[PDB]
Design a protein around this ligand. Structure first.
Ligand SMILES: [Cl-]
Ligand SMILES: [Cl-]
Lengths: 430, 433
């Protein structure tokens, strides 16, 4: 029933698993370090341990071994709702076990009680100019939340190393609860003239975020519940997850690690694909009309690709099949907005471009990912401010990042210290 | 030529060719092995990233572009009537790889002083936080406020070419380096001097202006800050703060975002508290044993202390067979400017007593101290006693090395950092075959 007690029971076995990996297989070779990897951003280098999720090359991303369709099947939904609740996903990442309906409701009320945000967090955000990037205002608010960090004081008070995960657990669960309040406050300030909406402790996680953003529609709540769940985690190799794990390895509290993760997530090469697709889709509907045939779209897709241009959300795939996170958002749109013209162009692109990409032979995997479909769903219901979309990404990704940060302290993972070299050193070795 | 950006523009194409040739000829050359111990131990022993501004010599210590600290002290220009190397000249060395003239250092000093303008909402952002907030938090939150004026964010939004990424990166870094002391000094005056803020002086050099804004106008403190900023400026890229900024920068985040994230890693107890731990420990030793402790009484204390399962702060943490040259150069300063300071005498006596004791016990590889065992008594002697703030001084200094590499990261067009992640299920499946 209680998440901290469930984690306490499950920790010792994985600790024993870790010791056996050192004792039995510590010298087992996983690959070779080459000059290509040191200069090419660790490309092809197995470098870190991330337990909460791993990418299956056949079934897509797996949250603790459960694929996206498996998650939709067994994760509890809200009463009067049909999409998997983000609380149940959070339970899965931390414990590895699918939660009951009662455990999700207990976790939902737990999150609602931890969502208190002190006034100096709002003061910190409001002190920034209106021109500040929403990711900057978001990250600055997280830095203000760091003042109430319980792991910082516990470490200063000399808590035992085997107890590090307990205040990390408290800070993470507090962070996960409070980050939507900060994220929605940034949204209301930039677009709703500071007309902030207080948190409702009766609602679940995704619905309370949608409510604080200014969207009380039940279908938007369903959209936000599904959005937070599917963007929650994706290995530890990405910049945001790696950053928080890297800052956390120095025994910084989760607020500092996640705030640093946001600065990495704010990178154009990391957290803007959602915005690139939506802006591109809107310009295509203006250039080619609303009801463009698939064959005229095929000629458009072919000319764009041969002109040296790419189709946003396409070509970036490392899966033999389409990203299951793309498919589930298509299922959502097919049920709740089939007449939306922007989705209709997304749907036609789903049919037309993958064959074109295969015929051109310039790209390995011609299938889209989740970023090719999330824009039209948010835009349809009124969340049109694409520049804010990375803030929504941050709220969801906090669930995966905080889950691994807890096991980093539960497993007692050491400080991350890759060795550095210079071009003089590499040339001297060759 | 007194133009720093033009010097960088001339030197970039050769370094780009060095990288391209390194891939074509030696891209497939093996540098080591990936093992399970390394993946589970935070990439310990794994050569993973490229850091050009410095590299550690196992015999001569850390080298700034191939120049050790004593070598740097000889050729780097100093202030008028002063002996410590100016951080501006060190910054020139890190950026260009060449030792600057006295005039080039002066040109960069006025350049930095002119870029040090800080808008009022940065102070508002910091003051919104409570006074009890950690100094690294108020500093990092202030750095986030400086990010609003980022020129690389706007330049990328306006679609500048990839081959010109370094130009707005250069502007942001020098702007960041110029203003980061202003924010850092404001945090110091706010937390410990009741908000009695001191404005920047455009006549002073970099290290002198920082000491001036912190509230220390004495020439001997300025000399200390010039030496402090210079020797802590950079130290490879494997440490958390340098790696973090490089990691956030690889996603094409501007230097303000990379440095603010770097500070959050630098605030980690395993990264930026060695300076604070040493000063607090020695002050407790002088209180437990009196002010004027003999060298033989310290051996008796150190022997009981080490045999009780305790450690001596600043000692044993060395990866150099000899003493860290950054410790030695600060010992030179203290032997010349404060030999009668009782706290330094304890550090000096520990320098004589502790290395022999540690070797007899055989538990430690290198029994020599590092820079963090000596910087505390220098700051504390002159009035900078707030040890909890010391990591902010570390951050201001380390911005010089981090920003210098961040410019070359875009100059060299280094790609996104994408190490592959695995789980224990995957590792166990890979070991059963
Ligand atoms: Cl991702
Ligand atoms: Cl260091």
């Amino acid at each position: 029933l209680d998440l901290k007690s469930q984690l306490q029971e499950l920790i010792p076995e994985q600790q024993d698993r870790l010791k056996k990996l050192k004792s039995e297989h510590g010298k087992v070779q996983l690959g070779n370090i080459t000059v290509d990897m040191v200069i090419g951003g660790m490309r092809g280098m197995t470098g870190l341990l991330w337990e909460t999720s791993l990418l299956d090359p056949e079934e897509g991303i797996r949250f603790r071994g459960l694929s996206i369709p498996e998650c939709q099947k067994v994760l509890p939904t809200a009463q009067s709702g049909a999409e998997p609740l983000p609380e149940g996903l959070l339970w899965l990442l931390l414990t590895g076990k699918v939660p009951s309906k009662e455990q999700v409701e207990a976790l939902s009320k737990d999150l609602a009680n931890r969502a208190a945000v002190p006034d100096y967090v709002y003061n910190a955000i409001d002190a920034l100019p209106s021109t500040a990037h929403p990711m900057t205002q978001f990250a600055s608010g997280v830095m203000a939340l760091q003042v109430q960090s319980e792991f910082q004081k516990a470490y200063e008070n000399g808590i035992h190393k085997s107890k590090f995960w307990e205040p990390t657990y408290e800070d993470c669960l507090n962070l996960i609860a409070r980050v939507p309040v900060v994220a929605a406050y940034v949204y209301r300030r930039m677009y709703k003239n500071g007309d902030s909406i207080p948190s409702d402790k009766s609602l679940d996680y995704g619905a309370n975020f949608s409510h604080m953003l200014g969207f009380d529609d039940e279908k938007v709540k369903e959209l936000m519940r599904l959005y937070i769940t599917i963007h929650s985690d994706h290995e530890g190799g990405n910049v945001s997850a790696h950053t928080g794990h890297l800052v956390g390895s120095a025994l910084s509290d989760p607020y500092l690690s996640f705030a640093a993760a946001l600065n990495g997530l704010a990178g154009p090469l990391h957290g803007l694909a959602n915005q690139e697709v939506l802006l591109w889709i809107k310009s295509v509907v203006e250039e080619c009309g609303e009801d463009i045939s698939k064959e005229q779209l095929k000629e458009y897709v072919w000319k764009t690709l041969n002109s040296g241009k790419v189709i946003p959300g396409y070509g970036h795939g490392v899966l033999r099949n389409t990203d299951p996170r793309y498919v589930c958002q298509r299922e959502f749109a097919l049920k709740h907005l089939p007449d939306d013209p922007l989705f209709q162009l997304v749907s036609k692109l789903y049919e037309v471009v993958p064959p074109v990409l295969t015929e051109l032979g310039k790209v390995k995997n011609p299938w889209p990912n989740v970023d090719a479909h999330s824009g039209v769903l948010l835009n349809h219901y009124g969340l049109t401010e694409a520049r804010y979309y990375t803030v929504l990404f941050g709220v969801s990704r906090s669930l995966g990042i905080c889950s691994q940060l807890i096991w980093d302290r539960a497993l007692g993972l050491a400080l991350e210290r890759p060795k550095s070299v210079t071009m003089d050193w590499l040339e001297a070795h060759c």
